[PDB]
Design a protein around this nucleic acid. Sequence first.
RNA 1: ACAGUAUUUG
RNA 2: ACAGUAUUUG
RNA 3: ACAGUAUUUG
RNA 4: ACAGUAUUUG
Lengths: 491, 491, 491, 491
Amino acid sequence: AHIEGRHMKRMLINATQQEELRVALVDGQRLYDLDIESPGHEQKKANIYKGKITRIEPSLEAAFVDYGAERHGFLPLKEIAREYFPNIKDVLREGQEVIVQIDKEERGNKGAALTTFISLAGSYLVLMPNNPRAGGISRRIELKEALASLELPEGMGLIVRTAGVGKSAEALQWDLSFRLKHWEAIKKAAESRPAPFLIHQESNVIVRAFRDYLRQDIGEILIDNPKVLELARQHIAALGRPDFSSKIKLYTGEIPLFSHYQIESQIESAFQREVRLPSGGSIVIDSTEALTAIDINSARGDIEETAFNTNLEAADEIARQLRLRDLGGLIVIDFIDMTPVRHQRAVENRLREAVRQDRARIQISHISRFGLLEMSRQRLSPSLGESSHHVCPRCSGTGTVRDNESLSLSILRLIEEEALKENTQEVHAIVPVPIASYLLNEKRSAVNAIETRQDGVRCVIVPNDQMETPHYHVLRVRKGEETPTLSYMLP
Amino acid sequence: AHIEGRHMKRMLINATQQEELRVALVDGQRLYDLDIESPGHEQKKANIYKGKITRIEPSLEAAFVDYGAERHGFLPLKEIAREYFPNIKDVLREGQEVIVQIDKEERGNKGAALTTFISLAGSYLVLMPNNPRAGGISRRIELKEALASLELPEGMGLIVRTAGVGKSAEALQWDLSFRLKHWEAIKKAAESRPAPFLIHQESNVIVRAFRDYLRQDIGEILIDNPKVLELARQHIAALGRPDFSSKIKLYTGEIPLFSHYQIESQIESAFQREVRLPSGGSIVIDSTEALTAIDINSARGDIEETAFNTNLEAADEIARQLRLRDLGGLIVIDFIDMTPVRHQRAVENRLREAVRQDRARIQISHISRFGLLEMSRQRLSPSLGESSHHVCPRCSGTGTVRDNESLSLSILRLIEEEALKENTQEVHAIVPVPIASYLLNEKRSAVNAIETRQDGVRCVIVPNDQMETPHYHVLRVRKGEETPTLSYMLP
Amino acid sequence: AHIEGRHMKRMLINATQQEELRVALVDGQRLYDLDIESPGHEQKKANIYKGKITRIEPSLEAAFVDYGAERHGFLPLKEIAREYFPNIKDVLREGQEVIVQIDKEERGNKGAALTTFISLAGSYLVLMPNNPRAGGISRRIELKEALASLELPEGMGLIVRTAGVGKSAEALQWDLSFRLKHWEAIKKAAESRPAPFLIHQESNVIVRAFRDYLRQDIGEILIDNPKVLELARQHIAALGRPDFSSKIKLYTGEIPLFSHYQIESQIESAFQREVRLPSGGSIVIDSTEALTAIDINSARGDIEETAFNTNLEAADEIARQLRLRDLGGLIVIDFIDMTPVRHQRAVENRLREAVRQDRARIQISHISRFGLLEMSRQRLSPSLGESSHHVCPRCSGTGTVRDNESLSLSILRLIEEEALKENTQEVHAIVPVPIASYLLNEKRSAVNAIETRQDGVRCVIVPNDQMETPHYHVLRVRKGEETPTLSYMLP
Amino acid sequence: AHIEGRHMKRMLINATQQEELRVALVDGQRLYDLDIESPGHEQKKANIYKGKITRIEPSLEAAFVDYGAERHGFLPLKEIAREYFPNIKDVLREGQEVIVQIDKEERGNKGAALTTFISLAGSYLVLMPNNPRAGGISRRIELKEALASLELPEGMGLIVRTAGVGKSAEALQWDLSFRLKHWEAIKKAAESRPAPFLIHQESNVIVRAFRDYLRQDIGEILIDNPKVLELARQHIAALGRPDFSSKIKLYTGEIPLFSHYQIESQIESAFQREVRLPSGGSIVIDSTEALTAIDINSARGDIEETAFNTNLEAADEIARQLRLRDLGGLIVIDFIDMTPVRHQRAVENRLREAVRQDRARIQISHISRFGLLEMSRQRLSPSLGESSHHVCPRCSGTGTVRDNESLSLSILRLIEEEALKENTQEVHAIVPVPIASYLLNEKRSAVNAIETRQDGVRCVIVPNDQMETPHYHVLRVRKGEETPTLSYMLP
RNA sequence: ACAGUAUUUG
RNA sequence: ACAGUAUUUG
RNA sequence: ACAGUAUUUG
RNA sequence: ACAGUAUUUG
Ligand SMILES: [Mg+2]
Ligand SMILES: [Mg+2]
Ligand SMILES: [Mg+2]
Ligand SMILES: [Mg+2]
Ligand SMILES: [Mg+2]
Ligand SMILES: [Mg+2]
Ligand SMILES: [Zn+2]
Ligand SMILES: [Zn+2]
């Protein structure tokens, strides 16, 4: 029934649990975005090291870097600067010491994009202290005015946040001040040493939150744990939006905060693969290796509507999940199938208009002739899956598991073929129990069959209870090289 | 290196193994399509029953049917006929007895499409003995001529197969003969009884093969098992392409047939999720709930090419897998990312030109601005996954598994919330072992924490070794209704 | 180094843990007997019900009884009384209502001995209020005098405890008083109702202890838990040895009581099968179905001594374990093997002199010519094993497990023999995994072998991971009665 | 119903199965002794090596020997000879090279008795070619005559087998010939080399059988496998009892030999712990570490008899099992409990008279006053248990398993005590799952309880599913030396 | 296997 | 398989 | 968080 | 805890 503005939008902080410090942004009781920072596996994006270059490969158009973790980090010739600046190899003289920062974070293989293009964020500003090229405003929005009046040095260009819109030129000075004043240290704190090492560490979840996600609509900030609420308050001081010290309250209620604001289930919502649409429909969000791929579908009085209407809900919800899951990359949405075009353009907008908030960039094509709508969106941090799951290790990634016989027939032809391989003595499949059962009954005859022909080739087939139903081995044992050792000792 | 026509295209039949009768269609040694019919789980599509109608729902635009299995079968008002014919409810008078056939087969939920629009296939013909509306030819291709000269009765219209192109009008008579002559029986064999029952059973894999997949290019038909080769031969007789009795030879070689033609690995190929591209690239074929979704990617001298070239291979291979997997529905292909448009149109065609064969219909849009190419293709039978796998039952479908702590924190808030629920005595999470470990150490304090506050609420938390890492229960035990019974007895 | 009398003998009570209330009797720091009463599985021996008689069997020389639990209770014609008294059947008129008490307790099969011969114990006395036949004194020990002066009614006879030896005739009156005064109620509290039901419940462990195990040598009684120490004190009051209120002190020390008195390990000692002898020898206490059977053996300067000496230690220790384990029945001790007879008579006495305490009766023959010394001892309550263990359920009782092959050969001949049994179709061994492995490799040939001969008898052999290494089934499947169902589905 | 002599006594050989060559000795259909030789784990007793002496210990009264396997072998000063002969140390000069043979075989610890007192067995004779001291006859039985007439050299003395009783002096010459003629080689075949090595290998099971267990009563010798029956026949030739070539027949019957002679079950009989007595009684044969211990008990018309009679059956059966199990050492039999002494002496004899056969020596005392009858018997080879089982590895030997709580309480006090141990940080019980469950619910409070007091001592308690119910660890973690690492990662 | 095939629809 | 066999003894 | 943002790229 | 206690006996 929801109209933005009806109830109060508040920022619920949840500092009760050590191993997990959550921060939802709720409007009334509709969770509408959430964050879960937890020690150890902290935030790395937005840091700044010093850098020398493992290896210029050109077959990609960029170096790598040692900023010294595990995997040296990706660095596109595009990233590279005036100042680093004395096609690839003429550009970067290798083992060169450079001031690289992290655009996008380790993803299962890759390093991370670094970029010698350092960016710096205050509450209302953002410094590019290293290319006076790019500036601007919150493409979200007097200060256009005030901005000129900005006393900017020339090496770099700047933007002005969505959230400086309230505020007063005086203090953009008072931002663009404290930035620089960093940026300086952030400079000479490299002029120091051999660079192979960190320099600045992007600040925790809360600050970040008080920084990047706080607006005029934010009613209260209930924090549920007095000692945080401590730093809580000090952190505004600095970040400096101090018309919010008002705004920041301590939750006492015995009933757990989030669990009070009735947004718990919503939290989960985000970890489930299906997600119910108001009407009663559903939104199954499957994630492939090429693109996340959401599919939509309907409940249980009209057809045309049923679909059209349920598509609109799907629209709304998909957006929110997009946010909750920190889903990035492409996304293909399979909207139901309505006939009248107006509906298509209808829902399309519906989507657009619903992802208006999303702090990340979002691009949204028309609906296809196969009724798929593709849609990109920017990789603001690691996604929930990518950072709170892993890979059903029975499957490998895929979520099916080969029916027992078709596996066995298979294991079995493998055996036979192995058992021709000139100069084999034994050969020793080692397979999930039922596999071994099925080969040795259902199929015994065949196995037999073999050794008869393959004169004198023993095909051992030992059933085992460690193996699950898709894994297995088929080793082969060359003349002479054969233990006498028990079938079941084989392992 | 492959040019169609270089080596001989042959049909390898493999009748050695009872529980699995395979039939690849190979051109030289490149498997290029394959079939695996196995008893029991036989073929159902293309059958013909008699039919009465469980329930007209109109909120879909069609009935259902009892042709008497498990799930009565889908029947679109579109399907419905003149003759059944006395918007939905005025159309189908319910419990009406009708002559329905099966377009598309049981899929995990659905019934199957039936269609009162019976279709009938000979070797060169295909009878529509029930709408003289639709006719035509093999949109693949003198007989245009011969076809008129066809002595067709009027109730129905016909097509002429790709494969009657060789042959002679005389014998289209001699097809369109034996069809009808069926179609008659196929008619009065309903005039018989209460209809709730089968009528005609689509014939096995081999016949089918000798029927639907045999052309002029087919060199030999090596069958590897004398007794089949028996029926083998008799089946041409009838189907009646007898200039092939020549063509059909018995394989003796000790080394297993397929394993001789060096097409084994290829067989598998089709069951793996990644599949290597010639160059050395790879084609990961992930399947979601909305669309199958293939992603492509490259090896280890130029960029532009590396991608462009590897895309072409992906093209080729995707086609073949599309066929081998009997993949239907939509498919989204994430081709690498080349800049020059010519390349895009290049690969696109490449794809088109490579799926020229595919017996199923295929539609192929341009490459998107997000560099996805979407692509539909017709559901010719059940897909390999859909009929030789199942659902990594540790995951549910999805192939990740929630990291242990984030689960535990979760299980745990559930407990707490349950333990407020006014009028609870005990409450009894029952969770995967490590879950129970982690809640009871790492987190003990918190659990404690609870019962302290929740005065006198026992939260039992019994670790169990039956449960795997994502499943678990959190039952709650109402005042009075509490056994005294051992923590570990809980189950 | 231990001389009785050196250090103080004290009674350590341990009431900290709810589910287990222990009471050791220590002399210095040598645990010398211990008790472990724990709720639920409480003490039943020494109770008194009312009784009617399920069934006179005479093929044993006694009835049974309903005192109404599970197994009606054993009742020897020997037990039976004057007053019950109107060879077996002439004696007990069946369904007769009687005042039976419990000599010895449920043992895995048996009921328990009841006895219509009720016995009653005070602190210094013991009433036989139902046969003036048997009287006496503590065959352990002026009162001989005082005892005559006892104002005894005539229906029954009495004894005087080891512990009335201190005390004064006045108060044996004051015992033999409060007894009777019970015994009366204990009488008319049957004159009440239909008897099928309890009457008096033998009192808990502590009272019992303050009653049956308290002497002049008992220095303190440290109890470690204030609230018990409460009832603690009240319980002397009554039982009435009140020159002990002095004696009974509260333990505070942070370090756990028993764990302070340095008698913990000793506790366990009693649950282990081997038990180290001072010198360094060992005492393996194995328990069979016919007799508990202790074996002795030696360490690592003389032979003759080494053995003789180590036998003496074994003597000492065996006694104590005999007590700790509440071991009853026969016991055979295999003392080392010394040559000189003096040593044999030496150790024998050593044993005698060491089991002087044992509250239970003990009888001790000479050492045999096979150098076994047999030895009976009275069943004072259930034994530790019999009440705190169970039966290595992999073995059945026996503690070996048949080597894998000898089992398999066996399972296998079973199969063959089953497979002759005229009119069998299938037959379906179902066996521990490795069993199934070994039969199907190592032995395949043989299995084959069978079906060849046993024309057309399928011997299925399904390996299974539920079964451990000694269990298994060999079902057989009669012509006609054969599912087609998967080898591994068999279960 | 069995009277010795009624049916034919025959020797069934069973050479069908490679991994197990059995040889029962049956009288009619009553298995009455059996043998199971199987390759690899062959027979070692009765071999002859050459020998030098690892280490004279005197604290035992004998050396050891290197005859070079694993454990050098026991060698009693008693064993030692004239000829080895230049109290212990003056006797055996160490590292001396000697001609030792094996009396009794490796038993779980020990070496084996060797004995420089070599013994040698023909069919009718037995050479002591190394002490003319000991001679004699079959204390089982003209030849007394013939024996003098024996042309014996003087260094050694001899006996004459039970089975030379048939036969003729001529041929005792013809035995005592071929012996010596060995004994010579058996001598100079040491005069050869450095002794550290074998010399003569006691011959397989069959020969042995044709040698040590063949008498006049032996009707046939059915062997069931033509090729054996081969060597079969040749082996008499040599051993030389050739009036038996007659006697030795080939079994053909399709139904398995033993399984035909209806003695299968009997085979097993011997591996079960209970064994039914004719009447319907039972004989539970439990084996301890001190003595094998058989207990007896009765069925379901008189008492006195019931017992007396059932004791007689037990007698019979015990004997046979004694033989089948190759049970050696002491044995204590708990016969039922009859009153009249005649019965005791009755059964006693019954036993004596029934173990008349037993090839091993047997000694049998009167029945005790506790109604145990002890009984020694000679260790003719390893016992069935000792060579075809192992140790229910859940128990350790003992066949009970400590009830779950009493374990947990225990594990738990261990924890607490560990957690006082000055200078501990963490401490980390690791226990069977249910153990961990029970400590963490049932008992949580207490565990808590601890850390509260033990200020700042973390007691981790990780449940684990590898451990079964009696095993477990309680490690302790010293200040400073503490990983931060997950509860469930602990292992 | 046909211009309404294919996709979609239970 | 013997009067010192057997049991025991590592 | 800016017209070159985002997607892509290890 | 007694001279018929204890062992045994379901
Ligand atoms: Mg890609
Ligand atoms: Mg997937
Ligand atoms: Mg859909
Ligand atoms: Mg008994
Ligand atoms: Mg045992
Ligand atoms: Mg011993
Ligand atoms: Zn999975
Ligand atoms: Zn066991």
